[PDB]
């Protein structure tokens, strides 16, 4: 079920403000969010 959760969570998270680092020109890293090899690429959401 993990995937069907991740998507939904992201859908809920991106409506809440933006990430200021996205204008810095510095790409974000692919942080692992579990075992088995799942990864996420997103800057911290700062400006609400």
């Amino acid at each position: 079920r993990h995937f069907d959760v991740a998507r939904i969570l992201v859908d809920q998270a991106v409506r809440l403000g933006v990430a200021e680092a996205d204008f810095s020109g510095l790409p974000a890293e692919w942080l692992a969010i579990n075992d088995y090899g799942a990864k996420v690429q997103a800057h911290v959401i700062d400006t609400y």
């Binding site: 996205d22 204008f23 020109g25 790409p27 692919w30």
Partner: protein
């Protein structure tokens, strides 16, 4: 052997994209978003490049 691969796609100062890099997958990359999200714009980026 060892087919070359497109690793990344960068958009700079475009409508909705000041500076955005997508890491192209080795097999499948899937853009997803509501109407007007700007996916056709990304494929436009790829082709025009």
């Amino acid at each position: 052997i060892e087919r070359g691969k497109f690793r990344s796609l960068t958009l700079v100062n475009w409508n909705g994209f000041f500076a955005r890099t997508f890491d192209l997958d080795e097999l499948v990359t899937t853009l997803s978003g509501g109407n007007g999200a700007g996916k056709s714009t990304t494929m436009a980026a790829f082709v025009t490049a």
